[PDB]
Amino acid sequence: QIKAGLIWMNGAFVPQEEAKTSVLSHALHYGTSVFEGIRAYETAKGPAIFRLKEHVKRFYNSAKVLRMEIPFAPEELEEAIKEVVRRNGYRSCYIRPLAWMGAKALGVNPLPNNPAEVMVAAWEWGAYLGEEAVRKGARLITSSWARFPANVMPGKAKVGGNYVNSALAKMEAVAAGADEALLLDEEGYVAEGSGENLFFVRDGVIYALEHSVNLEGITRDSVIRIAKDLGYEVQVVRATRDQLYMADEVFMTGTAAEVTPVSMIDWRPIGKGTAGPVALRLREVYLEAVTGRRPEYEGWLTYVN
Amino acid sequence: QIKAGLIWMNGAFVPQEEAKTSVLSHALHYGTSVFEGIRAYETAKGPAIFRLKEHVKRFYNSAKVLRMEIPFAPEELEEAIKEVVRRNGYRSCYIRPLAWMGAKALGVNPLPNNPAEVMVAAWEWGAYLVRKGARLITSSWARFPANVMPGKAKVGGNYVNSALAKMEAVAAGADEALLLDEEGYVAEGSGENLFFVRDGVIYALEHSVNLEGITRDSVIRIAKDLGYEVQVVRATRDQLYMADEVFMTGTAAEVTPVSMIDWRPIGKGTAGPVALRLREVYLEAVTGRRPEYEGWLTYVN
Amino acid sequence: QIKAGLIWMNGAFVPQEEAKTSVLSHALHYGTSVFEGIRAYETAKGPAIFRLKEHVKRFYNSAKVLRMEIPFAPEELEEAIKEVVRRNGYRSCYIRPLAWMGAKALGVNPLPNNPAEVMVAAWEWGARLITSSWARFPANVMPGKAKVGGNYVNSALAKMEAVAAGADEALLLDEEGYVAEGSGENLFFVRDGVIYALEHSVNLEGITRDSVIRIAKDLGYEVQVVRATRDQLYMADEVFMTGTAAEVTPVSMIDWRPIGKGTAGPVALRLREVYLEAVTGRRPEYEGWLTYVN
Amino acid sequence: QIKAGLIWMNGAFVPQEEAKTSVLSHALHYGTSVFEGIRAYETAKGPAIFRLKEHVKRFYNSAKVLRMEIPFAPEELEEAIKEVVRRNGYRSCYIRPLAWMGAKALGVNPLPNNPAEVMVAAWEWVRKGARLITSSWARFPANVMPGKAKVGGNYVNSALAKMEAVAAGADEALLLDEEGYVAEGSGENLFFVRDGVIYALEHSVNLEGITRDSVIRIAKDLGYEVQVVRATRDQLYMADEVFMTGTAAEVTPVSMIDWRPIGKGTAGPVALRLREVYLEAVTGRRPEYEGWLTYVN
Amino acid sequence: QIKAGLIWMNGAFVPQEEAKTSVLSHALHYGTSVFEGIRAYETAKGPAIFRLKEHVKRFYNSAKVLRMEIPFAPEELEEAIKEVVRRNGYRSCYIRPLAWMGAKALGVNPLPNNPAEVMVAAWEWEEAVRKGARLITSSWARFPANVMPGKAKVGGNYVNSALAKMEAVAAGADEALLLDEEGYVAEGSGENLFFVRDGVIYALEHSVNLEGITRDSVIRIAKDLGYEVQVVRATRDQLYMADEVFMTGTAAEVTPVSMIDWRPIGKGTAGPVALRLREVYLEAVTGRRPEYEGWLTYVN
Amino acid sequence: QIKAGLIWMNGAFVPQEEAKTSVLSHALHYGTSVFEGIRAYETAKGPAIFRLKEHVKRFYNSAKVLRMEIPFAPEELEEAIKEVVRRNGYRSCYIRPLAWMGAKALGVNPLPNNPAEVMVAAWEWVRKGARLITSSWARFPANVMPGKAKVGGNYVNSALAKMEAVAAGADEALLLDEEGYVAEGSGENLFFVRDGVIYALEHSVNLEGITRDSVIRIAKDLGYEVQVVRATRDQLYMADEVFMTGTAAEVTPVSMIDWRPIGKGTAGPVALRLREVYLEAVTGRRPEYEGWLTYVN
Ligand SMILES: Cc1ncc(COP(=O)(O)O)c(CN)c1O
Ligand SMILES: Cc1ncc(COP(=O)(O)O)c(CN)c1O
Ligand SMILES: Cc1ncc(COP(=O)(O)O)c(CN)c1O
Ligand SMILES: Cc1ncc(COP(=O)(O)O)c(CN)c1O
Ligand SMILES: Cc1ncc(COP(=O)(O)O)c(CN)c1O
Ligand SMILES: Cc1ncc(COP(=O)(O)O)c(CN)c1O
Structure with a gap:
């Protein structure tokens, strides 16, 4: 199992056990999701996320390709990404933002399913010494x-x-x-x-x-x-x-x-x-x-x- | 929304509201799932599923392509498909079997995530012909x-x-x-x-x-x-x-x-x-x- | 030069010298024309056109690909094709029907130029x-x-x-x-x-x-x-x-x-x-x- | 219709209505023509054609691809392009030079049809x-x-x-x-x-x-x-x-x-x-x- | 090592040791050779070569693709193939005919090197x-x-x-x-x-x-x-x-x-x-x- | 015929007539060889080979693509290349190093045939x-x-x-x-x-x-x-x-x-x-x- 802990789910953090979605979600059937991979490293000044804005920009850019609507401002997602690190007490970790088409319908066209559901999870990353x-x-x-x-x-x-x-x-x-x-x-x-x-x-x-x-x-x-x-x-x-x-x-x-x-x-x-x-x-x-x-x-x- | 009702989840039927999976499921991040589309039509002798065995065969064939392991025998899935129609009282309907890689890990390689999780859902479709x-x-x-x-x-x-x-x-x-x-x-x-x-x-x-x-x-x-x-x-x-x-x-x-x-x-x-x-x-x-x-x-x- | 003789031009035959079109014709600039190649052979019963129907059908089919409108019924074109042979006194000949976008405009999109202009010429083989x-x-x-x-x-x-x-x-x-x-x-x-x-x-x-x-x-x-x-x-x-x-x-x-x-x-x-x-x-x-x- | 006016046809200007070519022209059947798109803009010193040299060079380059022979020196075409503007009293216009294979024959090979016929037309923008x-x-x-x-x-x-x-x-x-x-x-x-x-x-x-x-x-x-x-x-x-x-x-x-x-x-x-x-x-x-x-x- | 034994070299059989070609051969530098793979199986009536005709036809067809000239008639090569089996006392074996451009010149164009050199070898299966x-x-x-x-x-x-x-x-x-x-x-x-x-x-x-x-x-x-x-x-x-x-x-x-x-x-x-x-x-x-x-x- | 003269064969020079290989050599059947083309030009100070090292480096690089093993160090091949010019008294010439899979076996996989055989020949330009x-x-x-x-x-x-x-x-x-x-x-x-x-x-x-x-x-x-x-x-x-x-x-x-x-x-x-x-x-x-x-x- 993945030790993620508190996960940001569409606006609020919830225990990992509650971070679930319908098996009828469009993305689970048709691959209609977008995600990012971001690292946070420990520094003398505490955890530092590497090139956060560039990753968030690509996250929204990926969504645009699928004509997927992310119901949150980039600023909100950035704060959530910082919070997933803080709230879980992480230092060296991997952050995984994910936006996916939900279960409103299962026609292959994902537009009727907008806006996308969004979540941000993170887990510890072992430092290589x-x-x-x-x-x-x-x-x-x-x-x-x-x-x-x-x-x-x-x-x-x-x-x-x-x-x-x-x-x-x-x-x-x-x-x-x-x-x-x-x-x-x-x-x-x-x-x-x-x-x-x-x-x-x-x-x-x-x-x-x-x-x-x-x-x-x-x-x-x-x-x-x-x-x-x-x-x-x-x-x-x-x-x-x-x-x-x-x-x-x-x-x-x-x-x-x-x-x-x-x-x-x-x-x-x-x-x-x-x-x-x-x-x-x-x-x-x-x-x-x-x-x-x-x-x-x-x-x-x-x-x- | 989708009116599926009772959904078969890894061996047992549960209310639609309970048919959920972790947002950390491999398939939600990497498209690592396989599914089928099967129709049941109302006949003079009740609901009849069209070419069920052929669809189930393709379902398992799709899994093999991803080296995905389905922890159920084809016969069990066929029974589940018949039951999703019966238990929900459907006549004409669309049946959607789905097998997906779960949340064991999120490395792109799906093998560590086997066996796949499986579910069968159905909803009224083709009400008018x-x-x-x-x-x-x-x-x-x-x-x-x-x-x-x-x-x-x-x-x-x-x-x-x-x-x-x-x-x-x-x-x-x-x-x-x-x-x-x-x-x-x-x-x-x-x-x-x-x-x-x-x-x-x-x-x-x-x-x-x-x-x-x-x-x-x-x-x-x-x-x-x-x-x-x-x-x-x-x-x-x-x-x-x-x-x-x-x-x-x-x-x-x-x-x-x-x-x-x-x-x-x-x-x-x-x-x-x-x-x-x-x-x-x-x-x-x-x-x-x-x-x-x-x-x-x-x-x- | 080509000894075509009488050429069918949009509904009527005219001397070859008069079978001309504007140099501003869309097809002369953008290749927006369609054509066919049909043969007539001399038989014991006179000239016989080979598989005229299939050729005319393909002519209209080609036009559809370009969304080109042929302002004539297939039956009319078929008559023109038979006529280009007999009006010119041909026996064994090659028949060349052609539909092209005219000079209404020179934007690359040919739709504004419809309907296409059409002509049928033939020459001894x-x-x-x-x-x-x-x-x-x-x-x-x-x-x-x-x-x-x-x-x-x-x-x-x-x-x-x-x-x-x-x-x-x-x-x-x-x-x-x-x-x-x-x-x-x-x-x-x-x-x-x-x-x-x-x-x-x-x-x-x-x-x-x-x-x-x-x-x-x-x-x-x-x-x-x-x-x-x-x-x-x-x-x-x-x-x-x-x-x-x-x-x-x-x-x-x-x-x-x-x-x-x-x-x-x-x-x-x-x-x-x-x-x-x-x-x-x-x-x-x-x-x-x-x-x-x- | 296109309001072109006087069109340069193989060496001389003629009324638009006279700028015609045989429907048996190779280019009308096989797309064997080359053309250019050139613009003239109004300036404080009268009409100015933009990068005329490059367009004319490309015109002849396109012809070479088809092994098409243009029976005029680039200098002649350049003069014709300037004249199509002058003679029609244009200021801001679009110029369309065109060289096409004529009606000498209709075999798909265009070589027997050389040299190409050429014309230059223009219209107000x-x-x-x-x-x-x-x-x-x-x-x-x-x-x-x-x-x-x-x-x-x-x-x-x-x-x-x-x-x-x-x-x-x-x-x-x-x-x-x-x-x-x-x-x-x-x-x-x-x-x-x-x-x-x-x-x-x-x-x-x-x-x-x-x-x-x-x-x-x-x-x-x-x-x-x-x-x-x-x-x-x-x-x-x-x-x-x-x-x-x-x-x-x-x-x-x-x-x-x-x-x-x-x-x-x-x-x-x-x-x-x-x-x-x-x-x-x-x-x-x-x-x-x-x-x-x-x-x- | 390969136990081929007697090898047919441009019209005559020679000991495997003598079956050699110049290192300046065109085919050794530019892959300009053609070959076949043919099998003989033991039967109640002695060794039988399988679809010899088709294999020889393809051999010559392959040469044509390279505009390679084989200086022997198909019938001659067919006899050479039967003989490579006989002379070596083979029953069940693999037969390998090979035609290659020689050492007349090393320009990439192989035409000046015609005609090709040919050999037929075989070994027990x-x-x-x-x-x-x-x-x-x-x-x-x-x-x-x-x-x-x-x-x-x-x-x-x-x-x-x-x-x-x-x-x-x-x-x-x-x-x-x-x-x-x-x-x-x-x-x-x-x-x-x-x-x-x-x-x-x-x-x-x-x-x-x-x-x-x-x-x-x-x-x-x-x-x-x-x-x-x-x-x-x-x-x-x-x-x-x-x-x-x-x-x-x-x-x-x-x-x-x-x-x-x-x-x-x-x-x-x-x-x-x-x-x-x-x-x-x-x-x-x-x-x-x-x-x-x-x-x-x-x-x- | 090619007038190569003395050819370096796996470590030693031999007369051209002796530079032969089995017709059962893997490379003669499956194209599994690598070679180079190097030139020497006559200068005021005698023959000079052009960019010898780059050519030798590419020779070994080509061998790696086929997972071919060359049983000689680059320095040895370079010496052989210089000697093929010297021993034959060449001034301006073309040098052809060649490494090929031998006759150990004829399965298409060349690995069992390693190491490759190597030779260096040259001839007047x-x-x-x-x-x-x-x-x-x-x-x-x-x-x-x-x-x-x-x-x-x-x-x-x-x-x-x-x-x-x-x-x-x-x-x-x-x-x-x-x-x-x-x-x-x-x-x-x-x-x-x-x-x-x-x-x-x-x-x-x-x-x-x-x-x-x-x-x-x-x-x-x-x-x-x-x-x-x-x-x-x-x-x-x-x-x-x-x-x-x-x-x-x-x-x-x-x-x-x-x-x-x-x-x-x-x-x-x-x-x-x-x-x-x-x-x-x-x-x-x-x-x-x-x-x-x-x-x-
Ligand atoms: C397909 C693909 N290519 C390249 C990369 C590397 O991109 P980045 O440096 O932004 O993580 C990734 C992320 N692991 C990827 O998913
Ligand atoms: C990509 C694709 N192609 C074809 C089909 C038709 O296949 P079938 O007749 O088995 O439903 C489908 C199913 N809708 C499909 O997903
Ligand atoms: C490109 C092309 N291919 C094939 C053909 C032969 O078609 P058909 O037998 O209908 O004349 C033609 C006509 N010459 C052709 O133009
Ligand atoms: C295919 C194509 N591409 C590009 C261009 C632009 O080229 P230019 O800037 O030289 O007009 C043109 C001219 N409209 C064109 O025909
Ligand atoms: C590339 C290739 N493909 C197919 C074959 C099979 O051909 P055959 O049945 O004629 O031996 C061969 C021969 N082993 C071959 O070399
Ligand atoms: C395929 C190929 N391409 C290019 C070249 C030129 O390479 P170089 O300048 O290294 O001789 C050669 C050598 N003749 C060659 O064989």
Whole structure:
């Protein structure tokens, strides 16, 4: 079970046991929900939520794609997100805002079901004080499931239904013995991980992948800024699986994945076969940023206390 | 609201108000659910469920695609479906079985969440039992490629594509959307399979990336039994534009004649004789008026 | 120049010199026209138009794709087509009906230009192919089941390429890489005695193709309809094309690779000959396909 | 009817009623024509044609795609374009040069019909923003129709999309390419703005717009960062602004796409600034952009 | 090592040790070779080669795709194939004819290298079959029909098969299932696919696949047994929900598939239809089906 | 026949006649080999191999794609490459390293055949412009064949396209990708020039050419603006210039594509200048590029 505790349900917090919805809810049958993934890190000044406004903006943007009406002002949701951290006494945690179409009707068209129901839940996130797993690097395997074309599913939004594609790819990767799946688009180019954006390094240059059919990662954005600030040249390109195979380094970014070095893809070692110095350095600075240790990046933090 | 009444929840019936699940359920966040759409029609011998076993088979088949484990034997689900009709005193009704990944965890991988939670609900539908024909508009959303979303399964997440297409069609002033596949060929409606008639021949569309409709299957058998020649082909939007007739099939749509597509009239511009004839025989079959099709019916009483 | 003679222009015949339209015509700028290709053959009973009905039906069907309004009843167009033959004293000829959007306005939307203008003109009447670098348009890009003027830019580009390469005709593939059709004809191939007609895919539903399939079945051949690749053609015993102008044309070579014996084969030659017998009124079984002008 | 007046026909002006061509013309049957869209604006120094050079160059470039021979030197066509304005006493007008394959033969191969016939005609010529709807017709792949040229046949695709959009209640159609990415409008190039950055769509299968080119230069001169990218429909849905560019459309803000409001739901500040500088430029009020104008007087 | 023994090299048999070619051979650098896979089975009347004629015809057909010239008449190659079995005293064996572009030049264009060099080599060939093979869908798509000639057994084509096979084995499967670029099922790395649903046998369309001779044989057998056979395009999930799935190929014969992507097919073991087809096929190749004797070429 | 002379075979040089491999070698049946193309040019200080390290790095990179094991360290292969030039007394020559899967087994899976066998052989080694024709064979998608590697099997696609081009009367083939965009020549990368700007094509499904890389650096050093873009066939048709790059092709101007003249119809100034400066670089006349040269003496 998930230890969420107090959950914000359409305007008010209620015990986890009361945070339930009808099994006739539109989103439970047709994937018509939108959600976010936000992290709060402990800092010398207490818990700090990372790039809250950017995540809330994307939350409302995802809703717009489904023509879903969120009956709350962004300001209200932001306060609820801060409150879910405070009320539960969390420090390092994962926050999951969710807006879903309710049970007014079950016609596939979700418009009659507006406005959407909304909830905000959060749970503890274990801090990583080790290093072996990160330095060993993650092992990826290219999926047999292609990332949806931009006119099939809205890849720039975090729409519930979209994740069936991610789920299928993730299960496949894990079954094959890998840590994560690397999905290609229908044309055969690299797209993204089941829940992470991809980067690679070659001859001193950092290559971020184009947005193509992927989600515009906030971690990706953060990493690009950090890289440029450190003096690295950053280029945005479309990439093939074999460009990754021969890269000096490959790494993934995501709210949950932070900055994760990738040491092997399809059983082919990447560079030295372990995490490289560039990815490790970016992860290092990124973590200093999210924990309030970099004054230049304080603007990205929202302290709950 | 939906007047479902008593809902079967993981082995037992409970009042609708109690049929709820955690908002932390995997399926509410990632579209990891599977469902079915089954009709029961009132007959002279009481309510009869149409092709129950075929629908239950597809339900379990959909679960397999997601590697979802349904903790009930097909026979148990069939009994539950018969009971949801009986216990609520329904005659004609729509039955909605649903299996979804619960709130054990929220990692995108659904395996840790097995087994799936299951429920069966039903509500009165088709209380009253077209000539103008439905108006369709081709969608700007393409039906998903076979390696993107499992189109042969009724997986919850798949319907985001159907939802986007349906909203677009309705907004454009049409009754339903006609989706093309990524290559540009006709696929299916947001929730119906397509057929067209030309020079006396009935053309059913290949399965391609569509759901293998049970109504489509029924219509093909009925057509052949009536003496019509039936061919299965891949089709383009303009093959439909010049067809003598076009019609859709689905559990909810039954057999629906299509009189216009993209503001271009199909044939006479109204429902044609072939679609109307197939519809009539189909309706006679589901209401227990055709001895030759009794095998497709499951009488609840 | 083209020796057309008397041309039917929106209801009446006029000298060729008078059969003109404004250079501001929508169709001259945006390819918004539809047309047909119909043949008349000389028979023992005079000129006979081949499958006039199917061609006229397709003409109106093409117009519908463009939401183009033809201000004449099919029966009227059919009479005009018979008249262009006899008024010009033609026996064996090619007939070209054309409907185009006029010069009422030049916004890309052709609806304000309806109804379309119409005219009917006519004039007295193995192959080596090369696969084109131009793909036949996807079914959601251009209406391949219609003979819309703009569609033929794709055909023109392919034909020029083929001729420039030293071939007689171009073989176009669809965007996915499968064989589609020639720049103006449908394709068939023969393997181990079985005749394979290509599925309609993004191609025009040929009337000659339809005729050839019926004749082939009547002659006792097994006919299957399939999707084909260029190498299935390379390895075929025979390959042939069909079209109103091309009739049944054997294909002896594709991409400099000989097909079978490298010369016209028996099946294609036989189908071509029986087809000619049908269009010239020598086969009673196909009399229904002919419309005698006299 | 179109009030064109005097039309330049293969070397000489003639009354509109005399500007006709055989119905057996190759282009009327197979879409084998090329054309341009050019505008003249009123200025304090008389009518000024906008970027005449670039339009004429593209006209000949389009002809090359069809291996069409234009029997006139670009300099001659330029003079004809200026004369069609003068002779008709136009000030603010739209100019439409057209080269088409004639009636020498009707085989699909246009080569035997060369050289092409040519004519030049012309006729006298926001806050709410335009509403677009994504089309069910995909923009042609680069190996299906020559999208970098204004070939007549190409516009059947544009016509189908425009009719669909209008029928759906929109002002213009937004076409995606076959892969599902945004391509262009039926006759306009697309841009979107997000967090202060202007995103111009890559050329992909689209026409290389001269208005698009002008807007990018203007944007950079105003200090805006401009990135050229591939875009999806939902990147547009989430943009702060979206706008279209074209000779006829000038710079047109887009307030809604697929019934989803863009940003505030009305024309945005960036699109409006670009539109204003563009209009100041074409009317001879920006010294730095005078090079783009050709004064007829 | 491969125990081939005497190998036919451009018209004459030589010891395996002498069967070598220049490392500057065009085919070793650009994949410009064509080959076949043929089997001989022991029968009561001695070794019998299965559908030799069809295999040789495809060999020459593959060469035509590359505009490769084979400097021997089909009849000569057929005799060489019978002899490779005889001379080596083989009974049950796998035969591998190969035509490749030599070392006359290394420009990518192979025409200057004609005619091709040719050689023919061969080598000796219940619970597992009943258990069924396990497949995993590959992340490598079978090449489009305008990218590589899928109807021919061109050497270079197999880089795609090799990549897919390695991936499947690495994933713990027996074989790879490749989809085409559009997402539909194509074929295995070296075999054609079929599935069975509600008593009907579904053979996959040729699409971008090789026109298998085993596939052809199985369809004829199936029809002779009275099964309805439909040729269709198929998706991975149509296979997931099929009652049975099986592969065909010269080496694979008729191999039931009990699992795909860790999802059991039907009962999770070999099904009855695939097993019947396999039984009749094996009876046929071993000379125990008079009606199919036309498919056999007895070496003695 | 090829006059290679002494060939390095798995650690030792042997006469050409002895450089043979079993006809049962996996690579001869399934295209499982990887190779490189390297050139040495005569300079004032003897033979100089151009960008040896980048070529060797790519050689090992190609091997990794096939999970092929090369039983020699890069330094050993580099020494062998220098020796193949020295031992044969070559000045200007083409060097061809090749690694292939041997005859241990013939199952399609090549892993059981590791490690690969390796050999290095070498042999002695515009104004009008090359004529290209667009191929009917598309360059393989990135998930069909590894286009960033020089894998033997990949070249069946190149071979088919080259034969087609030559048969059509052209010098080289221009392949498009499956989506219809320009990809690369059968063995060369493409560039085009328009309005003073040099456009290099994105990597897409193409090989990351070392000559392409060299030309881009040289162009920028000379003061040219260089942009990297996705291109269509008609963007090339309308370009002022088009040129190809490759180890064998060096910098080759393209004067015509699909019978449509590019610009003036003959080699243009930009391509000619880049070709000349490239030749100066590879022959040791530009100190700024000395780092790219490896002198064998
Ligand atoms: C599909 C997808 N892609 C990428 C990401 C990474 O985005 P972000 O950096 O904003 O969390 C996510 C979130 N895990 C995702 O769901
Ligand atoms: C996507 C889809 N396609 C087709 C259908 C029709 O299938 P059936 O006849 O089995 O209800 C449905 C059900 N409404 C559907 O959801
Ligand atoms: C593109 C196209 N395809 C096929 C055909 C053949 O059709 P039909 O047999 O009806 O003339 C034509 C007519 N030449 C055509 O224009
Ligand atoms: C297809 C297309 N795309 C874009 C444009 C805009 O190009 P320009 O700015 O050069 O007029 C046009 C012209 N209306 C066009 O026809
Ligand atoms: C790619 C491929 N597909 C299918 C097959 C099966 O063909 P056959 O039945 O003729 O051996 C083969 C041969 N193993 C093959 O190489
Ligand atoms: C497919 C391909 N593309 C491009 C090139 C050019 O690469 P480079 O400049 O590294 O020789 C080559 C080598 N001839 C090649 O084989």
